[PDB]
Amino acid sequence: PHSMRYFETAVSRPGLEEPRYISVGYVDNKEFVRFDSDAENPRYEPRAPWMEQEGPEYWERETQKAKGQEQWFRVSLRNLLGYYNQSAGGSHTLQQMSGCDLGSDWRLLRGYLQFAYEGRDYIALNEDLKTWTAADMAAQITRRKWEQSGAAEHYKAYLEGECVEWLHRYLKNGNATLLRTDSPKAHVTHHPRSKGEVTLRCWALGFYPADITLTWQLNGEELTQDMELVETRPAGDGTFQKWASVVVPLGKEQNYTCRVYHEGLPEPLTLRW
C-alpha cells in the first residue's frame, strides 16, 4: 500500500505575470520534498532526513522541472480564465495531484493524475491511463483537446516508469524511517457535561503513522452513532493525536470501554475511566 504523490498548487496574483507555485512531494503520506516560488531562492528542498542522501545534481534537476511547471500552470490559469469568462482582477487556483501506488505484491497498483480549479475537480486521468474524466463543461474542452494531442501517453509513461523507479528508491533509503511506528499512548478522561450525565474522552497521543481507529463499547456493542470523534491532528513533532468521547449517565461510566487499534499495537488496547 506504499505510494508517492506530488501536490502542486498555483495561485494567480492579480496584476502580476507570475503565479505563486508550490509543489510538495510525499512518500507514504510523509512530506519529503518541497518547492516554493515565494522563497528568496526557489528550489526543491529536503523535508525528511533520508533525502540528504541525494546529491546536488538531484536538487538542481528537480528545481529545473519546477520552473517548467510554473510556466505550465501560468498558461493554464490564463486559459481557465477564458473558459469560465472570469476577470483577472481576482485570484484563482489550479491544483494537481499525481503519483503512483504499490500493491501488496510490490507491483504498480495504480497511477494518479487529477486537476482542480478553484478547489473543485476539473479533469482526471482514468485508471486505464488512457482516458480522461471531465467534471464540467469547461473541462470537457480540455478533455477533447488532450485526446487529440495524445497527452495521456505522456502521463502514463511517467506514472508507470519514473514514478515507480523513485518510489522504490525512496522506500529503500527511508526504510528505517517510513516503515517505523510509534504506537499510541492512551488514557481516558472524565468531564462534567450536563445534569446526571458526564463525558468520557478516550485519547490517543504521539502515534505514527496517522492511521488509527478508536471505538467505544457498551454491553458488548460499539457506540457507532453515539460517539464524537475529532479529526486526526498533528502533534507537531511527526506524530499524531485523536480522541473519541461519549456522554454517559453519571454513575455508569464503568459500563463503557474504549478500544484503540493501531498498526503499532499487535493487540488492541482496552481502557476505561
Binding site: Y44, K65, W72, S76, K145, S149
Partner: peptide, 10 residues
C-alpha cells in the same frame, strides 16, 4: 522525482 506536464496546457 517530480513529473513534468505534457506540452498541452488546460
Amino acid at each position: 522525482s517530480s513529473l513534468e506536464n505534457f506540452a498541452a496546457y488546460v
